[PDB]
Amino acid sequence: QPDGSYKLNKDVDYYPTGLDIDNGDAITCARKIDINNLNLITAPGVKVGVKWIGGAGCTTKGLSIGENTGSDITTARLPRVGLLQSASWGSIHENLRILYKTQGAVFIDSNGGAAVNNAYISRLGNTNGELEQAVYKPAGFTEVGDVAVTQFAGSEVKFNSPIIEQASFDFVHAGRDTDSYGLFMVDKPHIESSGGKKKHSFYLINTSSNVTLSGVGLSGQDPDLDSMYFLKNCPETARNVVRGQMPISGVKLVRGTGNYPTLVLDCTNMGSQFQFGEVGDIFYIKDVVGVKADTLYIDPVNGNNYNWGTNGTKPIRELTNIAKICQLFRCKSVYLNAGESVITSNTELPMVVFEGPGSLKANSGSSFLIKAGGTLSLIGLSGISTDGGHMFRVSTVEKVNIHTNCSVNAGAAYVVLSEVQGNIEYRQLFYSVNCSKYIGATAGQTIAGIMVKTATRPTGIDAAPVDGNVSLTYKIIE
């Protein structure tokens, strides 16, 4: 108080922060409290069930909040917000059961080492759950819908084997505003929701996380917006690690906002997700460990960018992220379905075998980019061409092999332009080729070997197949 004395908090919305405990602004008087099977029901409309504030080291077992009164949730004897907790480091909630209407449990600020094991949190049905507006939440969370578990301001509660049902949002977690502190930790959540209604399972704001999936889960009915994960403004240094088993039924994995990918697939068991699920937004995946696919399928006509692209029945549509995708799953080939796969700005091609009836086109003066060593092979395609730019811009000093066994037309430009002091071997096999020079370079000498085995070629350059910035190691023509 102003006069220096202390008054018991009687405000429903008040919760002490770690700062308060150090400022002397707040003093806790919650200690040596143990709860065993306490059942708490409430009249409909009551705001909060239990305010677990300042309960450091306090424990709970079988605390059960809310009554399953009947089908209509608006008349059920349960609270809008089940439990609200802060300044409770070292507290343990064993087998906590909550029946809520708006928010199940909320954890804010200091809760170091606190644990919530085998919690069973569920909204009483999901009817109109999407209209529920969260009461205690981080500023970064502006979405509408009920939330089973909410955590923010640096609270890092360990959630072990929770069972979450009928929630729009299973988890909403935000790291500390200043330094993204507060790891979102959930081990094997059993998530279920009647009629598959759901918005997101993990809505993660400015934070890192470690989640182990147990083969149980789903993504909502909205084909564009709903996804298991939503990463809102997670910093470049953060990692949102996914381990375990993906749900059996197809789901859309991730969507987000922000300029940095943070999702990590750490030996994740994807089951049949490539065939029946969707990645959603490939941009947010930072890295993949122990998950491989042999081929990436592209279909400019029937493809869907939401797809993984690694299963033939679910190809992606554009070439924008093919290099990224091939690096992640170590793809050995790319299959181009019938139609013209095009780019309007410089795009990287992975050093793999391209096959199929499709064709490749570089429009608006763009070029395909080669940034890695290895062999890029175009075998049996309907052709590759550009509308004016050089076809392949090489920016790596490593050995680059370019194997074209399809029609090639760079028009007045080069098939290959080395932007560095390169080392390239190019080989044209049958079909046809057109260009002003097969290989060129921007400056200081590039070494190259060339084989052109086709009658349909620019015969006027047989004597001078490359520019002055390229020195030949071998030349096989005619």
User: Interface residues for ligand BGC in 338-397 (CB under 6 A)?
Assistant: 348, 371
- Beta carbon nearer to ligand BGC, 134 or 370: 370
- Beta carbon nearer to its own copies, 168 or 423: 423
Q: Which of 201, 207, 208, 321 binds ligand BGC (CB under 6 A)?
A: 321
CA angle, 217 then 221 then 223, to 5°: 110
**CA-CA distance, 64 to 125, in Å (whole number)?**
17
Residue 207 and residue 183 in contact, taking contact as beta carbons nearer than 8 Å: yes
**CA-CA distance, 476 to 16, in Å (whole number)?**
79
Helix (H, G, I), strand (E, B) or coil at 194: helix
The listed partner (its own copies, ligand BGC, none) that binds 301, CB under 5 to 8 Å by sort, is: none
The listed partner (its own copies, ligand BGC, none) that binds 425, CB under 5 to 8 Å by sort, is: its own copies
Q: Which of 153, 323, 408, 416 binds ligand BGC (CB under 6 A)?
A: 323
Phi, psi of 416, deg, nearest 5:
-130, 130
Residue 296 and residue 274 in contact, taking contact as beta carbons nearer than 8 Å: no
| Contact between 337 and ligand BGC per CB under 6 A | yes
| Contact between 315 and ligand BGC per CB under 6 A | yes
* Least gap, CB of 356 to ligand BGC (angstroms): 8
- Beta carbon nearer to ligand BGC, 129 or 315: 315
The listed partner (its own copies, ligand BGC, none) that binds 302, CB under 5 to 8 Å by sort, is: ligand BGC
* Least gap, CB of 268 to its own copies (angstroms): 9
Q: What secondary structure does DSSP assign to 399-422, as a single string?
A: -EEEEEES-EE-TTSEEEEESSS-
The listed partner (ligand BGC, its own copies, none) that binds 70, CB under 5 to 8 Å by sort, is: none
| Contact between 332 and ligand BGC per CB under 6 A | no
- Beta carbon nearer to its own copies, 92 or 461: 92
**CA-CA distance, 299 to 281, in Å (whole number)?**
17
Amino acid at the residue 263: L
Q: What separation in angstroms does the CA of 134 have from each of 47, 150, 203?
A: 11, 9, 13
- Beta carbon nearer to its own copies, 49 or 250: 250
Q: What separation in angstroms does the CA of 383 have from each of 262, 315, 438, 457?
A: 37, 20, 16, 14
Q: Which of 221, 302, 344, 459 binds ligand BGC (CB under 6 A)?
A: 302
Please give the structure tokens belonging to residue 342: 């095009």
- Beta carbon nearer to its own copies, 223 or 444: 444
Residue 185 and residue 206 in contact, taking contact as beta carbons nearer than 8 Å: no
* Least gap, CB of 473 to its own copies (angstroms): 4
The listed partner (ligand BGC, its own copies, none) that binds 68, CB under 5 to 8 Å by sort, is: none
Please give the structure tokens belonging to residue 164: 């979450």
The listed partner (its own copies, ligand BGC, none) that binds 228, CB under 5 to 8 Å by sort, is: none
* Least gap, CB of 386 to ligand BGC (angstroms): 18
The listed partner (its own copies, ligand BGC, none) that binds 430, CB under 5 to 8 Å by sort, is: its own copies
Q: What separation in angstroms does the CA of 420 have from each of 60, 404, 413, 436, 444?
A: 66, 22, 18, 20, 8
* Least gap, CB of 164 to ligand BGC (angstroms): 33
Helix (H, G, I), strand (E, B) or coil at 99: strand
The listed partner (ligand BGC, its own copies, none) that binds 330, CB under 5 to 8 Å by sort, is: none
Provide the H-helix boundaries in 290-341: 322-329
| Contact between 324 and ligand BGC per CB under 6 A | yes
* Least gap, CB of 439 to ligand BGC (angstroms): 21
- Beta carbon nearer to its own copies, 124 or 270: 270
The listed partner (ligand BGC, its own copies, none) that binds 323, CB under 5 to 8 Å by sort, is: ligand BGC
Place of tokens 């019938």: 338
**CA-CA distance, 76 to 42, in Å (whole number)?**
9
Select from 123-131, 181-189, 214-222, 308-316 the region that touches ligand BGC (CB under 6 A).
308-316
Amino acid at the residue 355: E
Select from 155-163, 167-175, 314-322, 427-435 the region that touches ligand BGC (CB under 6 A).
314-322
The listed partner (ligand BGC, its own copies, none) that binds 469, CB under 5 to 8 Å by sort, is: none
Please give the structure tokens belonging to residue 302: 């029937």
- Beta carbon nearer to its own copies, 129 or 250: 250
Burial of 328 (0-12, 13-18, 19+ CB in 10 A): buried
* Least gap, CB of 71 to its own copies (angstroms): 39
The listed partner (its own copies, ligand BGC, none) that binds 449, CB under 5 to 8 Å by sort, is: its own copies
**CA-CA distance, 55 to 110, in Å (whole number)?**
11
Identify the H or E element spanning 305.
none
Biggest alpha carbon–alpha carbon distance for the chain: 100
Q: Which residues pair with 379 in a beta bridge?
A: 405
* Least gap, CB of 338 to its own copies (angstroms): 23
Identify the H or E element spanning 275.
helix 273-276
Instruction: Enumerate binding residues for ligand BGC (CB under 6 A).
Output: 299, 302, 312-313, 315, 321-324, 337, 348, 371
